Amino acid sequence: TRKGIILAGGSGTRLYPVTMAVSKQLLPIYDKPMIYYPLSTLMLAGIRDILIISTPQDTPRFQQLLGDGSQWGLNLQYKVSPSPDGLAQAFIIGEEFIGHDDCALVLGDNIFYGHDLPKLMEAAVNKESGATVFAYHVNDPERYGVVEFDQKGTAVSLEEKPLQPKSNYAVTGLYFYDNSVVEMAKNLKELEITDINRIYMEQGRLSVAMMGRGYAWLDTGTHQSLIEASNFIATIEERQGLKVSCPEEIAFRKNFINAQQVIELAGPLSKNDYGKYLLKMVK
Amino acid sequence: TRKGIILAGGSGTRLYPVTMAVSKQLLPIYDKPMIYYPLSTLMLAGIRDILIISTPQDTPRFQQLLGDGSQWGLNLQYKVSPSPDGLAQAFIIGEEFIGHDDCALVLGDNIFYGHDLPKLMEAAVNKESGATVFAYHVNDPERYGVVEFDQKGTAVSLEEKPLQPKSNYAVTGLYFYDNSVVEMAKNLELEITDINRIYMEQGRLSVAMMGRGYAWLDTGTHQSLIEASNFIATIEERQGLKVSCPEEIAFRKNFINAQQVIELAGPLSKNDYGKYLLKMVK
Amino acid sequence: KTRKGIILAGGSGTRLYPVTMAVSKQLLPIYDKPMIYYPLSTLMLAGIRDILIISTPQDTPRFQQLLGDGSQWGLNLQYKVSPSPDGLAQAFIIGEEFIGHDDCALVLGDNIFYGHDLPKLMEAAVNKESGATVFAYHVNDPERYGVVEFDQKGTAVSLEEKPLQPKSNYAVTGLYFYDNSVVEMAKNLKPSARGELEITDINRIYMEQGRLSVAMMGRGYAWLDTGTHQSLIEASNFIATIEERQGLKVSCPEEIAFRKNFINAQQVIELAGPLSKNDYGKYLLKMVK
Amino acid sequence: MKTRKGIILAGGSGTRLYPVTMAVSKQLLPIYDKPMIYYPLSTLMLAGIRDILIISTPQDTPRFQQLLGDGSQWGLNLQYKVSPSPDGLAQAFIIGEEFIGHDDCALVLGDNIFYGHDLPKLMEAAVNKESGATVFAYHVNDPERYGVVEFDQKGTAVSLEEKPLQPKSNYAVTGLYFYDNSVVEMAKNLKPSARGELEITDINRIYMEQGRLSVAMMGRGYAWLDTGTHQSLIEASNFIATIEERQGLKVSCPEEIAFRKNFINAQQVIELAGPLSKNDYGKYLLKMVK
Ligand SMILES: Nc1ncnc2c1ncn2[C@H]1C[C@H](O)[C@@H](COP(=O)(O)OP(=O)(O)OP(=O)(O)O)O1
Ligand SMILES: Nc1ncnc2c1ncn2[C@H]1C[C@H](O)[C@@H](COP(=O)(O)OP(=O)(O)OP(=O)(O)O)O1
Ligand SMILES: Nc1ncnc2c1ncn2[C@H]1C[C@H](O)[C@@H](COP(=O)(O)OP(=O)(O)OP(=O)(O)O)O1
Ligand SMILES: Nc1ncnc2c1ncn2[C@H]1C[C@H](O)[C@@H](COP(=O)(O)OP(=O)(O)OP(=O)(O)O)O1
Ligand SMILES: [Mg+2]
Ligand SMILES: [Mg+2]
Ligand SMILES: [Mg+2]
Ligand SMILES: [Mg+2]
Ligand SMILES: [Mg+2]
Ligand SMILES: [Mg+2]
Ligand SMILES: [Mg+2]
Ligand SMILES: [Mg+2]
């Protein structure tokens, strides 16, 4: 079974004061809570069993918002982060959730857009040994974590903010692992996502999914990039008449739910265009 | 003493799903929680004693954000809304807070901008009998609650979404009352509009006019939220000033000194908000 | 036979005063390109390389200054001055000779089309062999545009200018495909109620003969009629946003000419020369290599 | 018999703006709902300058004439002259020696957009200053990018540096300048810089070396744009549209300025609003006059 984990805690200090009483991942990107975006991304890869890891104060808010996800044909489960850092700790926290299956991990503040994205993810899910990281062409590689890679798609170096960037590809917050990752994390010595990836690479089992022209990616963690993301979503939706990362639309079009369940869900949203969109969609 | 009340609850249903787990008044307008804006507006009128009324679930979040406001030279107090509606119920809820003083009321989703706004508010505070509502020129009066008024500034009719608008002035969510309002509310769901019509019927209702130069947003829809955010971002970036920055207001009105500002700028030093406060104090 | 197109790039742009008092509307920038780059790319994307541009007497030479004969892009551009303030169907009369025996497309100079699948739509309309294909766009306010109500076959059944009782939510956009019989219609047409030969008149005729198809632009497609101050700035912002966030140029003729093999990487490099002081030139260079 | 004069530099190639400036002068491009040149033009009007020389290229000068006429419609006197050289901006004072006569002169660049409630007070001060020149400076976060002026507490310039690696100040020199009549003389007796041409910067350094160069300071509250790139063009348009829409006022609307400063009456406004009645510009002018 396809599983995913969403990292949806943290402090959001760069967003103070708006993240002082509101989790970053609950902030609106246009007309949806931020977390709808990484969540839709998992849904588009056919992942219906998802663990959401958040802080002690805000975990119940996510539960208030998302329930158990059964309304969308999903199974959402929740777990509280024990440590401020050590993101690879996710695989330890969710060892049980993961069981014997392969797992995807996506960061709560990551916004992915692209017609061909699901094809990219289906390939990563199908790969059977190792891991697939997702890389995005940037003009300023020096600013992100940088992956230099093979023509096969195999990673050859991983460098955090390299002064001499080996490539123009930034590593995004979307990752695909086989089951051996839980094992790595347990036997790792704060535990970093980067360490885990370097391991797969050292074994040659690390692939790189390339997001080139046509793709958009935002790490929504600063006042500026939040408002850029909101505007980007608002513009795309208004000009091209489609919703971006609308979980009800995705659940419906992938047959997780029927037109009736959609109508009931559109009820509470009927005072705005979100509800009315869902209705036009089902007929 | 100058008192104010902020209505910061409600359901924000037009904003679903973003208001499903986050109070509307905690949503960001650019780089500040929405409530910073109505709160600054009160500060600019010299109001330092403010009651914040919110829902049971979100009231603690506002307290987490704002504390008791002592950091800004304010005295913030909190109270939970008992009824889904009946906004005039504010004066009943805060009867004790208000005591014998005059009171201002501002809605949590109202964003006011204008160089001359404080002059307008100083006049409304100084008026001694009755009430001052704040009106904003709009191209579509039929949309809002409309106030038709005298050349004296005295209201002569109040009409909710009139099909035949008597005027182009919409009533905004900023109101100034004398102490007699608590009394009206007790003896009156209880509407802010009813209360205003009473003052008007007694001739004691003035109208503060916000014409060209002023901006006003009721941030209650996805479209207007993003319009507001963009407006704030644009003004701040192009003209180098912050809109409704409580730390800046507290400092420039001498509620706090340069030191308290520096300590407050600490947590915000990872972005331009903190850095602004620092350039400001020197 | 050869694919031909005509761009209507004149008019007064009165809604845009005062910015169109000394500048043709179609030369105004939508972000980083003159407006006319957009309908012009749209034709290129349908593989149309022979294009007639019809403009006003004062501004026709400015278009020529900007575009030359289009040979730099593997095109053949030709120009003709509009004789009458109105009567858009007069295009087919003006270009009777340009058109010769071929089929023709017509696009309005202020129309901005965007959509991944747009070329497939247009290839279909080009291949249809009798009649005409109009292009329709789902709107929320049909009452505001000219409205086409249509069959499940794709055949138009009514055409209504700003209907009070809209028969459909589909607005007719300014992109049309005709077979050669259109020149004939236009020559034998007589003015509407406003004294002039209309594109709309021509379109119903085809519909009355059952030979009028409707290309449907649904979700995924964007369309702007850039003719008011507000819409001009919405269009500019839309282009800037797409280009910046997704790393691609919209309606960049040099990119289109290159990717459809009208021109090689060398011609691109020479064309990128004059634009090397901004991102437009630098984009063209990254594209080649 | 002293009169306020200004000169607008409104030629140039706009090469950073290719391809949109290939057949359209940069200064005729729209910033929201007005041709770019409306903005520097309004700026001069707000300083009470009603006699203005517009210098442009040979091909585009007639387009400015088509747009603006002789400015009599706005209570102005507009005159035109064609730039002889691609560069040498100080050549403006030579080209307009006759226009200027014995009067003081202001110079504003065609692509410069100034906004600020208090801007006219600033400019009235500069016009009143009687010996020397006033340059207009704008606080930036990246002084290294512009021409930088370091100055006195008196307001007297003490150094001028083009894109200093070690910026002596955070104040960029904008394209708005006020001169006394002695400037025509400087320009005639000036010799090319290291790039072959008479510079505005050379002229200013001279005033400064004589101590007669003041600095008008535009701090918080003020906006300034040098609209010469695709990005900045669209930022300026957006800024104007936002201010106008949110605050209900027009920015650099010459008909409004002519009317409020009494260059023209409510009737002339109504006739001018006629052609613009199909959009909000016309309709604004009408609401304004009543
Ligand atoms: N301890 C944690 N448990 C769960 N999720 C976390 C934790 N720390 C961070 N996250 C989430 C928040 C983001 O969506 C993502 C990457 O973190 P980051 O983008 O640095 O946000 P942050 O909350 O760390 O911001 P800041 O750097 O301003 O603290 O991981
Ligand atoms: N019962 C209440 N207690 C306190 N504040 C309230 C209450 N109801 C509404 N408010 C606040 C929220 C707004 O800032 C303001 C006006 O309400 P409104 O703008 O209708 O928001 P809302 O939360 O009612 O939105 P919905 O129509 O209601 O989308 O008063
Ligand atoms: N006589 C003409 N010859 C060639 N092209 C024309 C003519 N009239 C208009 N056009 C162009 C301009 C537009 O791109 C398109 C549709 O015209 P329209 O959108 O009404 O612009 P316009 O110039 O007529 O604007 P306005 O209504 O403000 O005058 O056809
Ligand atoms: N020879 C000239 N005669 C009159 N005006 C000029 C001349 N050269 C430039 N200008 C104007 C255009 C601008 O508004 C202003 C400053 O020039 P600048 O901003 O460099 O534009 P430009 O046209 O030189 O752009 P580019 O650097 O892209 O050529 O002076
Ligand atoms: Mg962090
Ligand atoms: Mg981040
Ligand atoms: Mg309500
Ligand atoms: Mg509201
Ligand atoms: Mg027309
Ligand atoms: Mg049009
Ligand atoms: Mg230059
Ligand atoms: Mg410049």
The domain that contains B255 carries what CATH number?
Answer: 3.90.550.10
Strand partners, D135: D177, D215
| Number of alpha carbons in the 13 Å side-chain half-sphere of residue C120 | 6
Residues 6+ apart with CB under 8 A from A241: C138, C218, C219, C220, C221
Helix (H, G, I), strand (E, B), or coil: what is residue A159? strand
CA of A173 to the centre of ligand 6 (A): 9
Residue C253, burial from CB neighbour count under 10 angstroms (0-12, 13-18, 19+): buried
Helix (H, G, I), strand (E, B), or coil: what is residue A98? helix
List the resolution, Å.
Answer: 2.6
Best residue for ligand 3 mutational test, from C25, C52, C112 (most atoms within 8 Å of Cβ): C25
The answer to whether the CB of C50 falls within 8 A of the CB of C74 is no
Strand partners, C172: C136
CA D27 to centroid of chain Cα atoms: 11
Task: Count CB neighbours of C235 within 10 A.
Answer: 24
Method: X-ray
Which helix (H) or strand (E) covers residue A211, if one does? strand A206-211
Q: Rounded to whole angstroms, how far apart are CA atoms A61 and B35?
A: 20
Q: Rounded to whole angstroms, how far apart are CA atoms D241 and D33?
A: 8
The helix-helix angle for B272-280 and B258-265 (nearest 10°) equals: 160
Q: Rounded to whole angstroms, how far apart are CA atoms C66 and D61?
A: 18
Q: Rounded to whole angstroms, how far apart are CA atoms D110 and B77?
A: 54
Residues 6+ apart with CB under 8 A from A33: A25, A26, A27, A65, B17, B18, B20, B21, B22
Q: Does C19 touch chain D (CB under 8 A)?
A: yes
Q: Tokens 């030279």 correspond to what residue? A: B73
CA of D240 to the centre of ligand 12 (A): 18
| Number of alpha carbons in the 13 Å side-chain half-sphere of residue D49 | 30
CA of B10 to the centre of ligand 7 (A): 7
User: Is the bond into C274 cis (omega within 30 degrees of 0)?
Assistant: no
Residues 6+ apart with CB under 8 A from C141: none
The answer to whether the CB of B236 falls within 8 A of the CB of B46 is no
- Chains B and D: how many Cβ contacts under 8 Å? 43
Q: Six-digit token pair at C6?
A: 């005509």
Nearest 10 degrees: Cα torsion B192, B196, B199, B202:
-130
Ligand nearest to the CA of D226: 12
Q: Do C29 and D233 touch (CB under 8 A)?
A: yes
Residues 6+ apart with CB under 8 A from A76: A50, A51, A52, A66, A67, A68, A69
Residues 6+ apart with CB under 8 A from D107: D6, D7, D9, D92, D93, D176, D177, D179, D200
Residues 6+ apart with CB under 8 A from B254: none
Q: Which residue of A has its CA nearest to C221?
A: A240
Chain D CB contacts of C16 under 8 Å are 279
Helix (H, G, I), strand (E, B), or coil: what is residue A48? coil
Q: Rounded to whole angstroms, how far apart are CA atoms C166 and C170?
A: 9
Q: Rounded to whole angstroms, how far apart are CA atoms D68 and D54?
A: 10
DSSP-assigned states of every residue in chain B = --EEEEE--S--GGGTTTTSSS-GGGSEETTEETTHHHHHHHHHTT--EEEEEE-TTTHHHHHHHHTTSGGGT-EEEEEE-SSSS-TTHHHHHTHHHHTTS-EEEEETTEEEE-TTHHHHHHHHHH--SSEEEEEEE-S-GGGSEEEEE-SSSBEEEEEES-SS-S-SEEEEEEEEE-THHHHHHHT----HHHHHHHHHHTT-EEEEEE-TT-EEEE--SHHHHHHHHHHHHHHHHHH---SS-HHHHHHHTTSS-HHHHHHHHSTTTTSHHHHHHHHHT-
Q: Binding site: what residues of C are annotated?
A: 110, 225
Q: Rounded to whole angstroms, how far apart are CA atoms C32 and C22?
A: 20
Strand partners, D148: D161, D172
Q: Phi and psi (nearest 5°) for C174?
A: -90, 40
Q: Rounded to whole angstroms, how far apart are CA atoms C237 and A125?
A: 37
Helix (H, G, I), strand (E, B), or coil: what is residue C178? strand
Rg over CA atoms, chain C: 18
Q: Tokens 């008449």 correspond to what residue? A: A241
Enter the DSSP assignment of C195: S
CA of A227 to the centre of ligand 2 (A): 24
User: Kindly report the CA angle at B43 between B87 and B77, in degrees rounded to 5?
Assistant: 55
Chain B CB contacts of D221 under 8 Å are 239-241
The answer to whether the CB of B97 falls within 8 A of the CB of B105 is no
Backbone region of residue C227 per phi and psi (left: phi > 0; alpha: psi in -120 to 50; beta: other values): alpha
Q: Hey, which bits of chain C come out as E strands?
A: 4-8, 29-30, 33-34, 50-55, 76-81, 104-108, 111-114, 132-138, 146-150, 156-161, 170-178, 212-217, 222-225
Q: Rounded to whole angstroms, how far apart are CA atoms B146 and B158?
A: 6
Q: Tokens 């608008």 correspond to what residue? A: B165
The helix-helix angle for D119-128 and D38-46 (nearest 10°) equals: 60
Q: Six-digit token pair at B63?
A: 């307290």
Q: Tokens 């510079």 correspond to what residue? A: D199
- In this complex, the chains that touch B, judged by 3 or more CB pairs closer than 8 A, are A, D
Nearest 10 degrees: Cα torsion D167, D168, D171, D176:
-100
Give the count of domains, chain D.
Answer: 1
Q: Rounded to whole angstroms, how far apart are CA atoms A122 and A105?
A: 15
Q: Rounded to whole angstroms, how far apart are CA atoms C230 and C173?
A: 19
Enter the DSSP assignment of A143: G
User: Kindly report the CA angle at B174 between B113 and B210, in degrees rounded to 5?
Assistant: 50
User: Does residue D229 have its Cβ closer than 6 Å to ligand 4?
Assistant: no
The alpha carbon of residue B226 is apart from the nearest alpha carbon of chain A, in Å, by: 7
Q: Does A239 touch chain C (CB under 8 A)?
A: yes
Q: Tokens 């709309």 correspond to what residue? A: C200
Chain C CB contacts of D33 under 8 Å are 18-19, 229
CA nearest to D45, candidates D5, D12, D79, D10: D5
The H-assigned helical ranges of A193-283 are 193-202, 223-240, 247-253, 259-266, 273-281
Select the residue from C245, C249, C283 to test the A interface by mutation, using most A Cβ atoms within 10 A. C245
Q: Six-digit token pair at A37?
A: 């975006």
Q: Six-digit token pair at D49?
A: 């300058």
Which helix (H) or strand (E) covers residue A210, if one does? strand A206-211
Chain A CB contacts of B222 under 8 Å are 30-31, 234, 272-274
The answer to whether the CB of D183 falls within 8 A of the CB of D142 is no
CA of D9 to the centre of ligand 11 (A): 12
- Chains C and D: how many Cβ contacts under 8 Å? 105
Whether A contacts D, i.e. 3 or more CB pairs less than 8 A apart, is: no
Helix (H, G, I), strand (E, B), or coil: what is residue A99? coil
Q: Give the type of residue at D60.
A: D
Which helix (H) or strand (E) covers residue A76, if one does? strand A75-80
CA B108 to centroid of chain Cα atoms: 6
CA nearest to C31, candidates C95, C112, C119, C145: C112
Q: Which of D22, D66, D67 comes nearest C65 by C-beta?
A: D22
Q: Hey, which bits of C151-258 come out as E strands?
A: 156-161, 170-178, 212-217, 222-225
Protein residue whose Cα sits closest to atom 22 of ligand 2 = B12
CA nearest to D135, candidates D77, D184, D206, D232: D206
Q: Do C274 and D15 touch (CB under 8 A)?
A: yes
Residues 46-75 of A with CB under 8 A from C: none
Task: Count CB neighbours of C165 within 10 A.
Answer: 8
Q: Rounded to whole angstroms, how far apart are CA atoms B42 and B74?
A: 11
Task: Show the domain range for C134.
Answer: 1-289
Q: Phi and psi (nearest 5°) for B267?
A: -60, -20
Q: Give the type of residue at B96.
A: E
Q: Phi and psi (nearest 5°) for D270?
A: -55, -40
* Residues with Cβ–ion distance below 5 A, ligand 10: C 225, 227
CA B38 to centroid of chain Cα atoms: 3
Q: Does D13 touch chain C (CB under 8 A)?
A: no
Best residue for ligand 3 mutational test, from C8, C59, C196, C223 (most atoms within 8 Å of Cβ): C8
CA B247 to centroid of chain Cα atoms: 17
Q: In chain D, what's the furthest Cα-to-Cα distance?
A: 56
Assign 3-class secondary structure to chain D. CCCCEEEEECCCCCHHHCCCCCCCCHHHCEECCEECCHHHHHHHHHCCCCEEEEEECCCCHHHHHHHHCCCHHHCCEEEEEECCCCCCCCHHHHHCHHHHCCCCEEEEECCEEEECCCHHHHHHHHHHCCCCEEEEEEECCCHHHCEEEEECCCCEEEEEEECCCCCCCCEEEEEEEEECCHHHHHHHCCCCCCCCCCCHHHHHHHHHHCCCEEEEEECCCCEEEECCCHHHHHHHHHHHHHHHHHHCCCCCCHHHHHHHCCCCCHHHHHHHHCCCCCCHHHHHHHHHCC
CA of D108 to the centre of ligand 6 (A): 44
Protein residue whose Cα sits closest to atom 5 of ligand 1 = A9
Chain B CB contacts of D220 under 8 Å are 239-241
Ligand nearest to the CA of A271: 2
Q: Give the type of residue at B2.
A: R
Chain A CB contacts of B230 under 8 Å are 227, 231
Q: Does C15 touch chain D (CB under 8 A)?
A: yes
The ligand 2 site (C-beta within 6 Å) comprises: B 7-14, 24, 53, 81, 83-85, 107-109, 220
B31 is in an annotated binding site: no
Strand partners, B54: B80
